[PDB]
């Protein structure tokens, strides 16, 4: 669309590379910092999708 089609999502962060022919639709908050990611969002806590 001219405004932009935002109906498509793709994973960006994962713990490790997956094996071939696998599916992972899990949603969570990746540990991207020393401080543990409690929830919601914030600095050093990246949402993968």
């Amino acid at each position: 669309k001219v405004g932009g089609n935002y109906n498509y999502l793709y994973r960006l962060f994962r713990k490790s590379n997956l094996k071939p022919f696998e599916r992972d639709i899990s949603t969570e908050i990746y540990q991207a910092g020393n401080k543990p990611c409690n929830g919601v969002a914030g600095f050093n806590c990246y949402f993968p999708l």
């Binding site: 094996k19 071939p20 022919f21 696998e22």
Partner: protein, 49 residues
């Protein structure tokens, strides 16, 4: 010696598109005169999905 119908193993379900209702796996051969039992053997492996 009356016991059956436990059911309700799970609580809720979600998106999934795999159903393989079919003929059962294990068959219990008749055991008679004692000292006569069948040893069920099963092995499961998971490679390339």
């Amino acid at each position: 010696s009356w016991m059956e119908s436990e059911f309700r193993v799970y609580s809720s379900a979600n998106n999934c598109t795999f159903e393989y209702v079919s003929q059962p796996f294990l068959m219990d051969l008749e055991g008679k005169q004692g000292n006569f039992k069948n040893l069920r053997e099963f092995v499961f492996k998971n490679i390339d999905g």
